Amino acid sequence: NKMEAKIDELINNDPVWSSQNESLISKPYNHILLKPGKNFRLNLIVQINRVMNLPKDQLAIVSQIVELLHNSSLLIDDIEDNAPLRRGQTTSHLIFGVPSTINTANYMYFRAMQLVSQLTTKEPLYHNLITIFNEELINLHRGQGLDIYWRDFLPEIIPTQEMYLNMVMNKTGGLFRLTLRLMEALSPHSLVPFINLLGIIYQIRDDYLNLKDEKGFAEDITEGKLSFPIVHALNFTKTKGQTEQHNEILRILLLRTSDKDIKLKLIQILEFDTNSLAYTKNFINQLVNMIKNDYIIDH
Amino acid sequence: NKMEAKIDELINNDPVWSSQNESLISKPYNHILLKPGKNFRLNLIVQINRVMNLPKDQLAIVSQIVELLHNSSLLIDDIEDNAPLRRGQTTSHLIFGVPSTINTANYMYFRAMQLVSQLTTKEPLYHNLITIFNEELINLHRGQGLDIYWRDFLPEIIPTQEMYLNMVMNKTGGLFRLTLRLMEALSPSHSLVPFINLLGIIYQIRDDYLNLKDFQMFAEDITEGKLSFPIVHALNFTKTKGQTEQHNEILRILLLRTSDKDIKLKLIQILEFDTNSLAYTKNFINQLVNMIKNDNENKYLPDELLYIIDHLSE
């Protein structure tokens, strides 16, 4: 009969997937492309290439891979932080919903992975590009897992500066290392230590500017993040016996508040009571002087 | 002095990660392991192996891969359907939160991928295994993305039965094909892929059917507004017969995202008395199983397998 014949045809062919289908599920992703991201990224990749010297067409693919992983990971990051804005517009998950956004972001992680084989035909080198991809993706999720856990289960764990830096080495260092390691493996004195330093500077600076200044006003406070200035402050208050301030910092973080005055109060506690903002600014300058007093690093 | 020296050490070493850090991010995953569920998956693998003959240690790994992807995919599946229960207990995202559960599930996807790399060191075969893994994960997400889309954009698109089957081929068939293709690529010793595709289709339709049938005998699929196989039949049946009020009433209840049992029973009544969608589905599953039962030639089958098939019969 015809039903059996049609079922037979179905199971003997590859799953049917159309262009229209590809478009429908790409919506959460297409939305974040509507706004440009730091364009100075292909900029960073172009700099590092002065040293790696990859051929233009191979470099392009590395760039596409990292751009894709980066843009899609932001979709997930914003769900995980329940963020309202990204690149000055509403986050995808508030528009298309959390379910679609998770699935689309995860879909793009595997599309990124598929691009890797466009880099080489040589089994050995391929094997190493894949291992690098797998390793850093593992590191990336270990660090983000720690960051989310500390924030969502606060005050169960109050991280020390040491713990925060290790989380960053996993998370933000993971994407910087991913980009550098792929290029070093493709290139015809590794820069890994230098790229780890850059990732840390970047994350701490990112935490700092969030309070010093589109994602909204000091949105890291609304999200309750254990940011670099917050970690210094929680440890500073514990160490100095400032019991009341230590507890009020925790309380404000736990409110997940959008109240601008409450956020401003916390920011001035970091300014005048714990001097965490100045501590952070100096810490950043000290890391930068590690490069300078030893060009990309200029941002 | 000191700070700089601590930073030098940090950036020159691999990222620090401990056993304690591993236990913390594994919490959402271990929770679902608290109940084994219908873990007889290891059985289908173990059985298919009688034809594939993979050495016991490679078989263990394929096994771990399948268990990891399947377990972590339910963590994500439950967040995507906002499900309250899984394997009889509160879903992980409701205990550990949506953020940690997504991250933990995604972490396990990559730990599964790293196991793939440990199946062989033959560089060519390795590339093939990675290609299979990559291809099926992509089909899986396309299928799940389409199922979610219809559900969340309802009533913009009402899929037909043919559309539903293509979605299922991508989604459900993705993990069955993934296990089978890996096993087949590894075998020392006609693909069983067509057979496994059919199994995945039977499995999913049967799953849609029992979700409504066990309630007739939670029916969370109704609360989620899912375009399940019986609901798809019911929507196209009412459209075809020009039954406007019934068509609309089915949409209204799905759109309600209701957990009110009397309303859920009302949709089931519609399916039972107006469209006869449950009898239709039962019969459709029977016709699929019979394609295996009457495969005298063994066009699809290589007995322990047929038993499974007949079991799935409704």
Ligand SMILES: O=P(O)(O)C(O)(Cc1cccc(-c2cccc3c2oc2ccccc23)c1)P(=O)(O)O
């Ligand atoms: O892309 P966006 O400008 O939205 C932003 O994520 C900037 C950013 C934050 C963190 C990491 C990166 C980053 C780091 C390393 C490499 C690359 C990054 O972004 C891209 C894009 C394209 C290629 C490589 C990278 C960019 P944002 O915090 O300013 O929103």
Ligand SMILES: O=P(O)(O)C(O)(Cc1cccc(-c2cccc3c2oc2ccccc23)c1)P(=O)(O)O
């Ligand atoms: O570190 P922040 O989250 O503060 C930020 O830099 C963005 C960011 C930087 C580096 C990594 C990630 C991130 C977060 C969640 C998941 C993943 C991330 O990066 C990858 C890459 C590939 C897969 C998953 C993830 C986000 P921001 O642009 O939101 O300021």
Ligand SMILES: O=P(O)(O)C(O)(Cc1cccc(-c2cccc3c2oc2ccccc23)c1)P(=O)(O)O
């Ligand atoms: O794991 P649970 O027992 O929780 C459940 O997913 C049922 C189930 C149990 C075991 C395996 C599977 C399953 C699902 C999709 C694909 C495959 C499954 O098992 C195998 C084995 C070999 C290949 C593919 C699959 C489903 P449930 O729907 O009853 O919650």
Ligand SMILES: O=P(O)(O)C(O)(Cc1cccc(-c2cccc3c2oc2ccccc23)c1)P(=O)(O)O
């Ligand atoms: O298809 P249903 O959601 O009805 C169910 O069969 C479970 C299921 C089967 C097959 C695939 C999936 C699924 C859903 C979302 C994401 C992913 C799924 O399977 C994988 C494997 C690997 C990565 C992601 C996913 C879920 P159930 O046990 O919840 O009834």
